[PDB]
Symmetry: D2
Subunit: 768 residues, 4 copies
């Protein structure tokens, strides 16, 4: 162990500022920093207008209290304000700034911004000692103060919708921007026209095609323009050719995603207008083009971003405390869902190298410099967008069947599309099993083609159909179908039942030979209870459904009346939704199953919130997991809070229900589904090659697994070794990672909870 | 004396429908209506793809349409028929080639759905008709006798363009939808927080029409607007910058400038958005971003208003097309004050050209008047609320006018209060805000509200002032005391049915308590739309859109091979407005309402009827139910019935919208409705109070306690006293509900055989 | 009434209390049959009867619940009679046993023990070591659990052939309905033994 | 139990059946009192008692419903006892009247008629419209007009309910420590 309230920061003064362009989630970030600091006993200060406000000093720097960051979670942009400071580019600016900082006793800094803000911060750390000299020399600071305020603790959070700070995987604001983007695309896709249409959409990304890329495989674009993998000479005709080909496959709406910094093999800008003319001239299709403006910074921050920003705010504060005089200025980030600290300079460096690599037309290097992830997504997108002519795909004469098992989860279709195509592209013959195991036993199996899964990416529900019935009772019939259709591998995109399903099948692989094939499961349920994966397809979508409902509930006025909302969430026994949703929507409490409670705890939380309602808060929020308790039902809690609040606030109950489980999948899920399904198929492909084409009998333990997010990677884990770490009575994993975050959500609600911060991040170097 | 639809057969006639010009949300709803209405009256309808192009081209561009052709296109933007620009039709050769293909198919009845252009072109085609048949018989391309048979061309048009540039038409299909798209963007920018001042320049559409720009402006309380009809006065550059800094000083941290495409100055010189950008960047230096909302204004799903409007017009077009004689002028079906009307094409085409002439000739004041009484008023109202005169230039009246919210919260009450408060202040009154309705009124919760206090209220949901359903009955003594102490001279209640009841009670008390002998106006605000004396309510459109939105989602989600039917309970109490209109807008098979009693037999019949549709044509069925349509046949009852009867062919899903979606953000239509009536109501109070000073403080007459509502074709003030006659106080709904005449439409559109009293249909009238 | 899927209680109770109808699982019904019975009883209420009775098995249908039927009969009766709903519930499952049961329990338990005594006097892996002492043909015979599987529906936990169902058409014609009555199992002359 | 807002049935029934607690409207309670009684009874269940009883007036509270209380006692009893809920309902409001009532009804109706008979031997006055009932120690006719003073028309129950003086009895008999105003106790009188 190494807890938080055993890491006091009493006496220290933290300054937080947001620089560069604004990005959804910044407020969530400062809210976390401010409160986390104040909680550990530190004293935090706001620094308006990014670096500008620091140079200017004076009132541009104010102390922040617990209520400063109150109710800004669901707010885009930044209440602190963010701008570009030209003065800070100069030596005079840095000096004037260091002075105001010293004038306020602030030696601990938290910079929230993009590649720029961060590299600038890095440099400020270097010149620190040097700036204090020049200041003491010119008699603007004390001669002894040059020793006290001698150590500058700097820590950064990447908060930009660009995602251009190489060395970091995810950044605050991107998922949100992606939402904005996909919302537009979706709005155009629900429009029907008889003639062929081509939509050219220009997203952001100065010299980074990340946004453009993820946007592309989020809506199955026909073509993408990235600054890292520019189009090969003679693309103009190639593109037009691809559009007409897709047009012939019945795709009546082409979508071209263009990055701002789109360029050709010679760094020449590829304008959206050039693309417009290109198709209007060559193909003559109804072409419309919109340059998604700053509107990509608008809207409310997605659930992903609010949570990410909160986790980072904590990481920034604890990092800032444990920082010694000789500890490198770092940048808190996340790697495979694990907190990590990366030294500023190392990142600022690689960031500049990627630019260098691109200017020097060494594009293949730029692509590799962005990250293993970026390179993979790029390939996966190409793989799914560009199909090779049938004759160039050496057949494997293997029939790979894909199926949906479990309750429907947003993004199952994106998953099936991805698996079917990667399969076809690998030379297999794809088979679709409808209505899960139920239909499997009833022989409802048919072949699916490349165009049959077109446009499935953004579709909610399960086009294939999905059931909760498990294979146990019908092991026979299935083994039969599996024989008469000559199935060589199985890809189940489902939930917990898919796992219980795989386990039953790996048991019968004893009494039945038809089951000795490779089988992978891909986690898909809003619950996020599949053993072996930290995330599920459809989980993000559901979480966003929650924050969306809470946003609305707040923005509505009740006059002088104080109101408290009790909201029941899905998840069965898994309080993931309830807990993370609670954190993301800023709830006072989130009753879950994993943390038992009695009438006393209940009474306590009511009094606690009743107090907040009497003063500071105007709108209270309480979440409750479906099955957190059988006696203390949603109504029970509603009734309790209602009676106890009499006179200070009234209640409103609200059960989200399972109607919001089939809406369109969020960008994050359409990409999650696309990505794992592809890695899973890749696995099947390879397992089959072990057969040499004359068929093998797969008996091994690791040939029936769950592909999931584990340590910091997407690793395949044999179903057999997952039993150990799973509670089959409540169908939830024995060790739930997100529970370590529960004490965070609490202290943010002004509670005093023990926070085991042992899993916090630690120094590491950028992986090349 | 009354005409019915099944009596006026069209058997033997052939109707051709086409969509021309730019696409506009609601066009599908329109052709769906035309196709089916035609097919129903026994006519035979034909599709004409690509607007006029397809007519010129002929051949397969013209196909017969059957009942299923227009199936499930209601919630679809754009047009499945396709719409384009035909250059060939601009020429005499085109018109000839077209008239030939039309004759070649026996189509002499035409329905053109498009904008100013498409329509003027249609008009001209009617003129040259006889002339074209000559030239065709002369060149032996048509029969000599056919020149007599196909001698009469029945043309009827529907204005379907997001511009609304066709003179003589109040509202056109597609505008409300475009406005939604626009306001969605604005709203997305407003939820973004920044510390420094920001200025957003948004360029909406409207070739040479500033309608869109205008309504967009008072839909979000813009700081400034640029219209082609009322260009800015010379020297505006500095004037604008001055207004922005002033607003900046009143704490408005985000300026919004709405610019119409055709924005021009007093000399027809184009006023670019980029010029506006620089103007503020240079003079004020605020963070200025500008987006040219592209074609994205035609995207998204068509709003409820547009789907309904388009359906009502589709019928009007068909019945008009039938009752058309050889000597009956080619007209354009439209709506005037919610009443169907037919306007002769030429008259409209004319005025349309006159408005352009008026603008080119810098006779702007004429252009403004040519747009319509409405347009001129909105323009004024917007200016009035956007430009406040300096306190000293506003002669005080020394009158205290109190504004209050009474009844269940309705989306847009805040827009209403903002509008009333400001118009009041601008009229020199001292404004008083009564919180928490009558409850707070009696408890003396009255305070003064200022011009900036209601800033940005336009787009806020719920009731900032607070609202209760309590009636002044039991607290006459308390309330009267409060008016007396606060010196309340006029009262403006923005609320629902209970607000009408309050007014009835207050009236009766003005005898005993003198303090109630002041003017009292009521403005209809409830999602129910049950206020006696008004065809519409503030918050009704918002609610209706909530319904169609939920139905859209429910459909777009796949269930595999499974057929699904949804039962949805709507609000409204006893008023089936929501249920019925929502049903029509979402395309439901049935909508059980209170106003139309039903028994188990009717129930059983509709189930069988829909069960049939599910077995074939439909894949997704929809059934709506009013909250209180019956006490025994509850939502669950109907769910259970349809469920059992569908066993084997489809499964059910139940869903109660609930009152949680009664406090979301108000739809554009409502923020403007609220703004508009509240202003007219205040104007009334101002005028009443001035004759106090002259005529006499003798406010003990029915005519001084009114309900401002949409009646005949105007917004007229009706004394509460004479409304009692026409209202059923037991169920709190008006005795005569206009929308019920539309019920038989919704039915026949669902493939039922219902008697349709089409007596209220439109008839030839000349534009005012 | 209780019974799960077994409409014994509902049916026999209906007969015993003189009910117009007894909706049970074993005899599926649709909205038409339902509508018919309402009209039929509505008629009786208009004249002869002053008090009408309708019984419903717990699980006779999942869509046509107790409330459903209550609501239907209520609406159709409007003007001629009002309804009252009432769920016996499982609270009246633990009252004192009726004379018949205290004697039934005493009697079989004794015969069963007698069997055990005789079996354990023989000293088991055969199918007759495990039975179900119960009333069959005309005797209390021991039947091996194994051969009972054949004649039982494990999905609804009720025997495949329920003897009392032959009595259903009786309860009906007594309610003034016209039902086919298979009276094949009727009695026939025998000699007293 | 029935009674609307009048906890007569709940209270007296509680006393008569020996219940641990009888939640009524006339005596407001909060979650703390509630929690206390559960603990108190949970204790008795752990030892002495084998069967516990709790009564609740139909409308004693709108938030702490019958189910609420059932759920609370159920959760707090987990491990020591289980719960069973039961709503008497209005079906047992039409059974045969008990001997006491058939005689009560017979007796007052007769005295009431006797009054009418006497009144008709000679009406715009206010003592001509009474309410015959049991008051002090007699069955006296009281004009409806003077009864308004002592009645709460909002919950339709008299302002002063005599049986409430018995409430503290039912409690101490359940082993609670309640203040018992025994002022109305009896005093030595001579047989009259
Ligand atoms: N090389 C640098 N040296 C000093 N300061 C810098 C440097 N680069 C950036 N900054 C600081 O950051 C400010 C804004 O830079 P920039 O726009 O690159 O930040 P950003 O966060 O990467 O922007 P974005 O949010 O759009 O990604 C500069 O005006 C300056 O104050
Ligand atoms: N004067 C005209 N004579 C013949 N045809 C015309 C004329 N004006 C318009 N049209 C027909 O309408 C087509 C499109 O014109 P236009 O774009 O003005 O229509 P619209 O309905 O006003 O478009 P929108 O919906 O964008 O306002 C023309 O290409 C032509 O086929
Ligand atoms: Co290289
Ligand atoms: Mg930034
Ligand atoms: Mg940057
Ligand atoms: Mg058009
Ligand atoms: Mg036009």
């Amino acid at each position: 162990r190494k807890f938080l309230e055993h890491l006091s920061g009493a006496g220290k003064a933290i300054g937080v500022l947001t620089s560069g362009g604004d990005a959804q989630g910044m407020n969530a970030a400062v809210r976390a920093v401010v409160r986390m600091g104040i909680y550990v006993g530190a004293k935090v200060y706001f620094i308006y207008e990014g670096y500008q406000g620091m140079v200017d000093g004076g009132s541009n720097i104010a102390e922040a209290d617990w209520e400063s960051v109150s109710s800004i979670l669901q707010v885009g942009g930044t209440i602190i304000g963010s701008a570009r400071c030209q003065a800070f580019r100069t030596r005079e600016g840095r000096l004037k700034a260091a002075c105001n900082l010293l004038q306020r006793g602030i030696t601990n800094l938290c910079v929230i911004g993009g590649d720029g803000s961060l590299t600038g911060a890095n440099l400020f750390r270097k010149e620190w000692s040097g700036l204090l000299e020049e200041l003491a020399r010119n008699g603007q600071i004390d001669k002894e103060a040059v020793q006290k305020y001698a150590y500058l603790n700097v820590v950064g959070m990447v908060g930009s919708i660009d995602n251009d700070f190489c060395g970091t995987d995810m950044t605050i604001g991107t998922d949100s921007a992606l939402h904005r983007i996909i919302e537009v695309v979706d709005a155009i896709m629900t429009t029907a026209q008889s003639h062929q249409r081509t939509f050219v959409l220009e997203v952001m990304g100065r010299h980074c095609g990340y946004l453009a890329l993820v946007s592309a495989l989020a809506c199955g674009a026909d073509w993408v323009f990235l600054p890292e993998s520019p189009p090969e000479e003679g693309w103009e005709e190639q593109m037009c050719v691809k559009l007409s080909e897709n047009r012939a496959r019945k795709k009546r709406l082409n979508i071209i995603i263009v990055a701002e910094g789109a360029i050709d093999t010679q760094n020449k800008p590829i304008t959206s207008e050039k693309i417009k003319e290109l198709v209007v001239t060559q193909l003559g299709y109804d072409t419309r083009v919109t340059i998604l403006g700053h509107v990509q910074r608008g809207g409310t921050p997605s659930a992903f971003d609010r949570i990410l920003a909160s986790r980072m705010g904590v990481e920034a504060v604890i990092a800032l405390l444990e920082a010694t005089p000789d500890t490198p200025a770092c940048v808190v980030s996340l790697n495979g869902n694990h907190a990590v600290r990366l030294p500023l300079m190392e990142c600022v460096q690689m960031t500049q190298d990627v630019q260098k690599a691109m200017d020097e037309r060494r594009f293949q290097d730029a692509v590799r410099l962005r990250g293993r992830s970026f390179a993979g997504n790029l390939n996966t997108y190409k793989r799914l967008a560009i199909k090779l002519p049938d004759d160039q795909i050496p057949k494997t004469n293997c029939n790979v069947a894909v199926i949906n098992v479990g309750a429907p989860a947003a993004g199952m279709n994106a998953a099936v599309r991805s698996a079917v195509r990667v399969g076809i592209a690998d030379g297999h013959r794809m088979l679709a099993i409808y209505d899960g195991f139920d239909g499997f036993a009833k022989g409802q199996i048919k072949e699916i083609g490349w165009t049959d899964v077109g446009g499935w990416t953004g579709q909610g529900g399960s086009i294939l159909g999905t059931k909760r019935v498990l294979p146990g009772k019908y092991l026979e019939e299935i083994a039969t179908q599996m024989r008469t259709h000559s199935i060589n591998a199985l890809l189940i995109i489902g939930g917990f039942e898919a796992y219980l399903g795989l386990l039953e099948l790996s048991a019968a692989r004893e009494k039945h030979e038809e089951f000795c094939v490779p089988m992978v499961m891909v986690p898909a349920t809003v619950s996020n209870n599949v053993p072996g994966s930290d995330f599920s397809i459809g989980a993000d979508t559901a979480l966003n459904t929650i924050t969306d409902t809470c946003d609305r509930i707040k923005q509505s006025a009740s006059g002088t009346k104080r109101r408290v909302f009790i909201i029941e969430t899905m998840g069965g026994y898994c309080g993931y939704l309830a807990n993370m949703g609670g954190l993301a929507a800023g709830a006072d409490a989130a009753y879950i199953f994993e943390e038992p409670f009695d009438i006393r705890d209940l009474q306590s939380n009511v009094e606690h919130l009743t107090e907040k309602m009497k003063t500071t808060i105007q709108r209270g929020l309480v979440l409750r997991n479906e099955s957190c308790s059988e006696n203390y039902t949603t109504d029970f809690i509603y009734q309790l809070y209602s009676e106890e609040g009499k006179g200070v606030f009234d209640c409103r109950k609200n059960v989200l229900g399972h109607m919001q489980q089939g809406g369109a999948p969020s960008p994050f899920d359409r990409n999650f589904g696309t990505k794992i399904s592809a890695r899973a198929m890749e696995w099947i492909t390879a397992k089959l090659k072990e057969a040499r084409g004359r068929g093998k009998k797969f008996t091994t333990d690791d040939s029936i697994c769950v592909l999931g997010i584990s340590k910091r990677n997407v690793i395949f884990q044999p179903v057999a070794e997952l039993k150990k770490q799973t509670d089959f009575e409540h169908r939830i994993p024995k060790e739930q990672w997100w529970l370590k975050l529960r004490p965070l959500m609490k202290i943010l609600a002004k509670y005093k909870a023990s926070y085991d911060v042992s899993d916090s991040g630690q120094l590491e170097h950028v992986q090349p």
